[PDB]
């Protein structure tokens, strides 16, 4: 009863034909380097090796239109344009390999589904899916932002339909808003979608994910956009995400009280990225602590699935920290400067905006006042004296 890992080198074949390496950030070396890091650190040997598979067209159609699944899930046995790099794609970001991309994208979904079901049924404690292409930007009938099929959303739908799971939490800590995942569950109160993302008043990719997007119909209140606004003045870092987890993510998630937790685990908020791709300064170590916090929910029934994250050192460092956390290893302590740092004013304003909006729906936010400005030490000092 341990941590599972799923990975498949056939996902490396989703690759542009152009030969212009610097042009495509979402490249095969992303998952290849993560897998090598997990192997050489000994973490792979501590985990169960889970074999993936291709998702069926019917499984993909729990989220996407039939036409969308045929266009991107089958090959001829137009929506595709000749790109300036010389390859083919659906937009300037999102390449299409006419031979390999359909199978690779279906394999990414199937890997996530296989791992998610083994955790949900108790064959595994928890797990991490090392998959590409990413999924959370793909809408019902629109690929975008490197994504074709929303692997995490498909897994959640299948949990509902095949295992009758009544409460699913999706946490999305990729630096970008998961517009596809938000769409897929917007009217559904049985799935809580919670995204932390760079929002900057709608001036960052993809442009969605405002705090006042709370859901629709019976789903009102079950969509939580922890949207950071203010730009990179200063960039968000460990203190800001830890405060957001303390004030927003964990109180709401605990009140929701899920049966299963799915994490859209992009690492493009880690320090060392080109600022247009994220520009935040999270440490890899911090993602281990965030993972450990989410492991307290749903009895530990949690799966992380790789989304974005592009700097190889950054995503390998963060994957290592997250898998170490899933295995129950002791994490390195956070630096003293991080524990003592108060979240920056833009993050405080961002957190308080979200709390004001969702105080209408969540009793845990009908708290007395806001503690969003407290450092971790200041918050822990006030917790010990209370209880």
């Amino acid at each position: 009863f341990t941590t599972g890992l799923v990975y498949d080198t056939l996902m490396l074949k989703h690759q542009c034909t152009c030969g212009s390496s610097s042009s495509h950030p979402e490249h095969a070396g992303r998952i290849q380097s993560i897998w090598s890091r997990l192997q050489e650190t000994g973490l792979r040997g501590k985990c169960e090796c889970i074999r993936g598979r291709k998702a069926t067209l019917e499984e993909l159609q729990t989220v996407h239109s039939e036409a969308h699944t045929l266009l991107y899930g089958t090959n001829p046995l137009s929506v595709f344009v000749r790109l300036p790099c010389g390859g083919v794609g659906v937009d300037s970001d999102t390449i299409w390999n006419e031979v390999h991309s359909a199978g690779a994208a279906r394999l990414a979904v199937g890997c996530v589904v296989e791992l998610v079901f083994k955790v949900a049924t108790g064959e595994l404690k928890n797990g991490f899916a090392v998959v590409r292409p990413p999924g959370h930007h793909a809408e019902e009938s629109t690929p975008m932002g490197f994504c074709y099929f929303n692997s995490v959303a498909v897994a959640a739908k299948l949990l509902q339909q095949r295992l009758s799971v009544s409460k699913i939490l999706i946490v999305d800590w990729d630096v970008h808003h998961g517009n596809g995942t938000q769409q897929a569950f917007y009217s559904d109160p049985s799935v809580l979608y919670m995204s932390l993302h760079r929002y900057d008043d709608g001036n960052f990719f993809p442009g969605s994910g405002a705090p006042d997007e709370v859901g629709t119909g019976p789903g009102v209140g079950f969509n939580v956009n922890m949207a950071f606004t203010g730009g990179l003045d200063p960039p968000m870092g460990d203190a800001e995400y830890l405060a957001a987890f303390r004030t927003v993510v964990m109180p709401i998630a605990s009140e929701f009280a899920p049966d299963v937790v799915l994490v859209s685990s992009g690492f493009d908020a880690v320090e060392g990225h080109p600022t247009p791709l994220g520009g935040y300064n999270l440490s890899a170590r911090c993602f281990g602590y965030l993972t450990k916090q989410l492991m307290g929910l749903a009895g530990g029934r949690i799966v992380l699935a790789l989304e974005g994250g592009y700097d190889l050192t950054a995503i390998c460092d963060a994957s290592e920290a997250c898998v170490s956390a899933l295995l129950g290893n002791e994490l390195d302590p956070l630096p003293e400067k991080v524990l003592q740092q108060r979240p920056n004013a833009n993050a405080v304003r961002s957190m308080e905006k979200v709390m004001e909006i969702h105080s209408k729906y969540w009793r845990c936010l009908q708290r007395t006042t806001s503690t969003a400005g407290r450092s971790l030490i200041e918050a822990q000092t006030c917790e010990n004296e209370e209880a």
Binding site: H137, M144, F146, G202, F204, F205, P206, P276
Partner: peptide, 14 residues
């Protein structure tokens, strides 16, 4: 029309 780019950090618009 449509613009927007994850590589450039530009939101999708119009």
């Amino acid at each position: 029309h449509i613009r927007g780019s994850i590589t450039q950090g530009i939101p999708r618009s119009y």
